[PDB]
Amino acid sequence: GDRVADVIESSIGDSVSRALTQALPAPTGQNTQVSSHRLDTGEVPALQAA
Amino acid sequence: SDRVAQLTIGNSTITTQEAANIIVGYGEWPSYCSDDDATAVDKPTRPDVSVNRFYTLDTKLWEKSSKGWYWKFPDVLTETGVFGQNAQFHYLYRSGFCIHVQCNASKFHQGALLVAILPEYVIGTVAGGTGTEDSHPPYKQTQPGADGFELQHPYVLDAGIPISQLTVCHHQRINLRTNNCATIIVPYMNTLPFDSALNHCNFGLLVVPISPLDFDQGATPVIPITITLAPMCSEFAGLRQAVTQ
Numbered sequence: 001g002d003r004v005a006d007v008i009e010s011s012i013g014d015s016v017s018r019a020l021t022q023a024l025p026a027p028t029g030q031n032t033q034v035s036s037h038r039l040d041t042g043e044v045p046a047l048q049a050a
Numbered sequence: 051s052d053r054v055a056q057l058t059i060g061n062s063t064i065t066t067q068e069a070a071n072i073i074v075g076y077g078e079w080p081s082y083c084s085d086d087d088a089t090a091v092d093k094p095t096r097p098d099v100s101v102n103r104f105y106t107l108d109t110k111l112w113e114k115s116s117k118g119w120y121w122k123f124p125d126v127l128t129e130t131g132v133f134g135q136n137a138q139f140h141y142l143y144r145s146g147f148c149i150h151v152q153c154n155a156s157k158f159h160q161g162a163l164l165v166a167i168l169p170e171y172v173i174g175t176v177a178g179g180t181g182t183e184d185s186h187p188p189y190k191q192t193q194p195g196a197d198g199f200e201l202q203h204p205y206v207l208d209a210g211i212p213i214s215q216l217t218v219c220h221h222q223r224i225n226l227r228t229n230n231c232a233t234i235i236v237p238y239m240n241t242l243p244f245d246s247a248l249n250h251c252n253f254g255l256l257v258v259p260i261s262p263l264d265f266d267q268g269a270t271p272v273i274p275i276t277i278t279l280a281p282m283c284s285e286f287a288g289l290r291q292a293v294t295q
Binding site: 035 | 091093
């Protein structure tokens with residue numbers, strides 16, 4: 001018997017484990033693709049934030 | 051239409067009027083490395099004419115009491131040309147070869163040479179003769195360059211294996227009545243798709259007179275033998291500073 005909106009709109013009792021991930025099949029090592037020269041701005045795949 | 055040949059690769063050209071034929075080693079032509087077989091991810095440089103071309107090493111004189119000579123590959127071309135700089139500047143290497151051996155003489159000379167390609171021609175020692183010493187050969191003798199090294203005991207090829215059964219590898223025979231050239235085309239032979247040119251030698255080239263040279267005096271007593279060789283389908287990978295040995 002739920003009537004107020006503070007309990008209909010609730011997430012209490014959410015037992016499902018919300019995961020950000022997904023296990024995918026990796027039977028072999030990852031293959032390598034062919035790559036060329038890039039001489040552009042904006043995109044910097046070597047600069048990271050540990 | 052068999053005793054004449056024109057071998058054209060790059061900016062070089064060998065004409066022959068007294069050929070036998072061309073031997074293709076183990077029935078495989080030289081090739082490049084597949085993507086299935088490769089493991090290194092670097093993109094290899096494939097210089098197509100600056101290193102795939104005929105080089106000419108030096109001359110050896112076939113005298114009466116000559117015993118034989120060997121040349122180790124690719125030690126012959128590590129101080130010679132644009133090939134031998136890329137081999138220094140790179141860590142890996144992969145090429146076939148087209149070897150060509152010339153020995154011209156009259157129709158009054160006679161003799162035979164065995165020209166064989168032996169993979170992984172590991173060199174042995176006389177063990178001091180007695181057989182007690184676990185001696186090892188020097189670097190002068192293991193990898194002697196383009197001036198080659200002469201055999202002391204050519205019956206056993208200085209490794210304990212007999213000359214007689216060497217025709218199970220690639221070979222041609224230079225019979226001075228019949229021919230004066232020998233063309234052998236070698237693929238890349240290794241367990242690995244790539245290897246270093248400065249530490250590992252893929253095969254050796256044996257030149258052995260089975261029949262002694264003979265001529266009557268009045269003729270020309272100087273009969274050279276010249277080795278002429280082309281890399282084929284060459285590939286290099288792994289770039290760093292140049293190192294000689």
